[model samples]
Every structure is written in structure tokens, then in C-alpha cells.
Target: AGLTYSQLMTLKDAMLQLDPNAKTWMDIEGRPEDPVEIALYQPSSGAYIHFFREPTDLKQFKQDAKYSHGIDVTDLFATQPGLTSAVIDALPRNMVITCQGSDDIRKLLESQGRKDIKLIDIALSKTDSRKYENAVWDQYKDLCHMHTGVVVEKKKRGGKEEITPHCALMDCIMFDAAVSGGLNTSVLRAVLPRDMVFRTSTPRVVL
Candidate 1:
């Protein structure tokens, strides 16, 4: 289920409390070719929170097409205003909070008298069809793998076309891990460039 306006407002308040400069009511980064959709964002931490109201084909693709790609929201619950507020307020005392699993967010949700919110289980392995060979994986094979279903772009060459792996989810996860000191500098160096991974001024939240 999606969030109600009131729930969104509650979350907005909590977000502002965390980062006063954070932006709200922004467009979500949909598939590059798809029309831009609206979402929420926080600038300080570069968090993009999304509220998926209806069952989407993209959600399904992530589940079945991505080799048990985990992170399912098909049965997501609406965030209760009070519960949501408490969870946000109690978030880790850091500039950014990385939620790689439901446990990270679920504990907060459960503490606020909620039990319906559950985290999707991710099962990654060498046998997964969605795992592909790419630059990111080639450099950090032990720490990450390519997201085969997530094609960031397509390029044309003469009469042939090439598809580029985006590694979108892995990028965020690895970055978060690096920021939190969960991963070493070697891992960080492998994924990011020497210039640094920069975030734009636009404020957005990704769910």
C-alpha cells in the first residue's frame, strides 16, 4: 500500500527535523526512458523515498526477472503517521542512514507498535540469472555483483546496439556501506571514481 497525504506530511516533518535543508515533493528517477514520476528526497543524505501505490510491472520484473532479486514491496504497508514519526525520529544519529535490509528499518517500525511492515529477503549467488559480468563486479567480485535486469542505457554502433549495466542498487548499497565504514577503502575505490561520487542539488528520497 502507498502512503496517505497525512502520512507523507508526517514523514516530511520527520525528514526536516533530520535535515532542515532536505527537499520534498520531487520527481523520482524512473527508468531513463520512462516519464519522470514524483517522489520524495532528502538532500543531506541523498535519500529518495518512493511510495508505490499500485502493483507495478517494474516491481514484478525485480522479483521474477532479476533472479530472486529480493527487495519486494508488493505487500508493503502504509506508514502510520505516529509510527512513521517515531521511526524517523529514532533513526541513527548520522548524516545518512543506510537501509540494506528490513531489519534495519523493521526494528524501528516494530518498536512503534507495528508488525505488518516486513523486509524482503535477498538471495544472491553465482547461479542467479540476473548476475552479470561487468566493471563493478570485475573489480569487487567478493563484495558485489552486476544487476543484470537493470540496464542503465543502450547505445548504437553502426548497425549494432550495446546495453550498459547500471548497477544502480549496488551503487547505492556499496556507497552506503563505504560511508558507514562497513566496507573498506579498497571496495570504495573500486566502485567510485577518483573525482568522487557527487549528488545533485535536487532533493529527493528513494524508497
Candidate 2:
């Protein structure tokens, strides 16, 4: 059955409990019975917190941040449910972001004052056969005026065809400034099928 509003509200309330603490999924896993937490900090402090998954008790924490309302360095915020809509609402109409860095573009943005940019880190993971990542990027391209380049992760250990490297190159082309803005929700729905699943969620686009 479809999810109900009451169920969704319950999830949101539970997630609120985790919104202010400085704990990661790995940290919570170590204490399985405790509540989830978020720990925002200064980049220079050398203290790093990353959340890989949301707790079962707080399912809304699993929503994607591209549509959420706050800044998440480790991507915990973007993965929360209704939060995505809140983020989309908060984005400016004429947003622009310049992406840079080798392994952590999200960190680079936060350092440069683009704190609200959603952070995604799917560098080493599997993806479905369809191109869902490209589609999501396309949606953002239409909503904002921006110049950004993504350095997609290239899988070093793979077959001779170099699947990962090829994918990275393809991403660069597909997400290029000139090729992306024409993207809209309807086009995305048509170009991609319903079962498209992405394994990685890093190198997020900022605008």
C-alpha cells in the first residue's frame, strides 16, 4: 500500500530528534538502541562525522537532501524524507555554484560559503542499469542558472573496458553546462524507467 500522511508525520517527528546531535550512522550502530544524531562542526577542527545510513526508528532521515532544507557536509540531511521538499523550497531562483576538489567537492563548497549544497558520496558503489544520476542532475539544471563541473570517481580496479572511467567521462559530458539545462521533470520521467536505482550519492551538484 502507499504511505499515509500520519505515517509520514510520525517519521518526520522521529527524525527531528536526530537533527541536532553530532552522531553518525556508524556511531549509532555502535549503540544500536540510542537515538540518531547530527553533529555540525567547523571544517578546520579535523573532527569528521559521516552518516552512511539512517536508523530504522527514524526513517525520514533516509530522504535525499537535493530536495531538503539544510546544509549537510556528510550527506545526512539530504537523505531525510520530506526534507527534500523543504530544501527545494528554500533554494534561490538564480542560484549558481562552482564545483572543485578531487575527493570532496561538498567540503570545498562548505568552505566557500555554499553551506546549503547537498553532499552526496557514492564514489565506490554499484548503480542500476538506468541513468538516474544524470536525470537528477538534469532536474537541477533547469531550476537554477549555474556553472559547475563534477569530478566523478573512476573505479581503478575493474575489467579491461574500464567501466568506471568510462562512466566518469560520460558523466562529465552529460552534466556539462551546455548539455544539462534543458532537463525538466517530464523529460526525466520519459527518459528513465521507474526502477532506476543509484548506488553512489557523492560529488553532489550545488546551486
Best by TM-score: 1
Residues 19-128 of candidate 1 have per-residue lDDT tens digits of 53332212212231221111233334544432222123565445332332222333222312133233334333332333323343445444544454333333233233
Instruction: Give the alpha carbon lDDT tens digit for every residue of 1-207 in model 2.
Output: 222465445434433332222211111111123222321211122122222223344344223121221123243333443322322222333333221112344433344455664443323223332244455444434421111212233346863221221122123223332223432222211111111111244555898
Count of residue pairs whose backbone atoms collide, per candidate = 9, 21
Best-matching candidate per lDDT: 1
Q: Relative to the unseen true structure, what is the C-alpha lDDT of residue 53 in candidate 1, on a scale of 0 to 100?
A: 25
Cα displacement (Å) at residue 165, model 2: 5.3
Stretches off by above 4 angstroms in model 1 are 1-5, 20-55, 58-64, 71-173, 177-207
Q: Output the lDDT of residue 104, model 1.
A: 32
